[PDB]
Amino acid sequence: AQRPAKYSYVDENGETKTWTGQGRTPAVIKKAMDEQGKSLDDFLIKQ
């Protein structure tokens, strides 16, 4: 609980895990967003 990093990322493999680490957007997210990125829901797990 108490995890500000509620945002999730998805790569080629499928590492559907929270951003965390440094809390930023390196490239994986940007790539997935450009290729698909339907909505914010694609990364944010709603809640």
Technique used to solve these coordinates: NMR
| Cα angle 18-11-1, degrees, rounded to a multiple of 5 | 10
Secondary structure letter of residue 42 according to DSSP: G
Domain around 37:
1-47
CB of 17 closer than 8 Å to CB of 9: yes
CB atoms within 10 A of CB 35: 7
The C-alpha atoms of residue 14 and residue 1 are separated, in whole angstroms, by: 23
Give the DSSP letter string of 1-34: ---S--BEE--SS---EE--TTSS--SHHHHHHH
| CA dist., res. 25 & res. 1, Å (int) | 23
Q: What angle (nearest 5°) sits at the alpha carbon of residue 15, between those of residues 1 and 46?
A: 50
11 CB-near residues (< 8 Å, 6+ apart): 28, 32
Domain holding 33: CATH number? 4.10.430.10
Q: In total, how many domains does the chain have? A: 1
